[PDB]
């Protein structure tokens, strides 16, 4: 999506410092807590009955780690995002039937989490590149049926 060398640097530079397990657990827990309807898709994960239950839910945390690992595959190949997420697109759209709006919401949550973890590095300009990133992943996953 025509990344500038500067944008690519904001992304790869920050990601190298990211605790994927921690940021991933936070992002997914916050999705489930801030936008509670998303819990519909995680019935098998056990107790999600409160914010504290969700934050202590082992599978939520493990799953968040796998999700942020997936974002890492976008970071690692910024010019082939659409293709990298084709299979996941089919999964979320045809199998899981997750409305695409929720991809956007998870992206916004990740932006906020990155901000709490990297107060200094996450400048407005860094935010711009990372917002471009999460939106590109959301768009790629939305191709799944549109």
């Amino acid at each position: 999506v025509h990344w500038t060398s500067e944008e690519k640097q904001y992304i790869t530079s920050l990601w190298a410092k990211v605790n994927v397990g921690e940021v991933g657990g936070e992002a997914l827990a916050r999705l489930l807590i801030v936008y509670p309807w998303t819990q519909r898709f995680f019935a098998s994960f056990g107790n999600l009955s409160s914010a504290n239950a969700i934050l202590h839910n082992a599978k939520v945390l493990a799953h968040g780690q796998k999700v942020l690992t997936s974002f890492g595959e976008a970071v690692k190949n910024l010019d082939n995002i659409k293709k990298t997420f084709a299979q996941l697109s089919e999964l979320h759209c045809e199998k899981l039937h997750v409305d695409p709006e929720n991809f956007k919401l998870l992206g916004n949550i990740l932006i906020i989490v990155l901000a709490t973890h990297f107060p200094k590095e996450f400048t407005p300009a860094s935010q711009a590149a990372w917002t471009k990133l999460v939106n590109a992943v959301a768009h790629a996953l939305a191709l799944g049926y549109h």
């Binding site: 936070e26 801030v34 914010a51 932006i111 906020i112 989490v113 901000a115 709490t116 300009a125 711009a128």
Partner: protein
């Protein structure tokens, strides 16, 4: 709606914001302008360079209005009535933009609170900022 715990989490974070009203508001606005450049077209009369007097003075006003909303959380529509007419009738702000600025404000909060911007705090501010945004747009419905 907002619980008493939500309100307590909000005030604890807010009394810090009130200490630097100008810094916080300007940072939220500039993140919006830089990350979502289409919002800049609402401010053609502003010098939008970093830390411009217009951005900082306006930032403080935005934070001040949010602070008023915090005080009168149970009477939002009335308290923001004049502002609601301003943004809808006069400025014709696209409702999507209230969400963009709300989001950018949360980024500023996250950056400044770090570890203390917990999920519980984020939920509280998300509910608060959504409530304020609904009111500033209610003149469209």
């Amino acid at each position: 709606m907002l619980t008493e715990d939500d309100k307590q989490l909000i005030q604890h974070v807010w009394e810090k914001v009130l200490e630097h009203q100008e810094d916080f508001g300007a940072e939220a606005l500039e993140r919006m302008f830089i990350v979502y450049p289409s919002t800049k077209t609402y401010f053609p009369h502003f010098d939008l360079h970093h830390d411009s007097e217009q951005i900082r003075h306006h930032g403080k006003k935005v934070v001040g209005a949010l602070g008023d909303a915090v005080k009168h959380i149970d009477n939002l529509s009335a308290t923001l009535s004049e502002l609601s007419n301003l943004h809808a009738y006069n400025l014709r702000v696209d409702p999507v933009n209230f969400k963009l600025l709300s989001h950018c404000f949360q980024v500023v909060l996250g950056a400044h609170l770090g570890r203390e911007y917990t999920p519980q705090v984020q939920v509280a501010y998300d509910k608060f900022l959504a409530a304020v945004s609904a009111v500033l747009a209610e003149k469209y419905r």
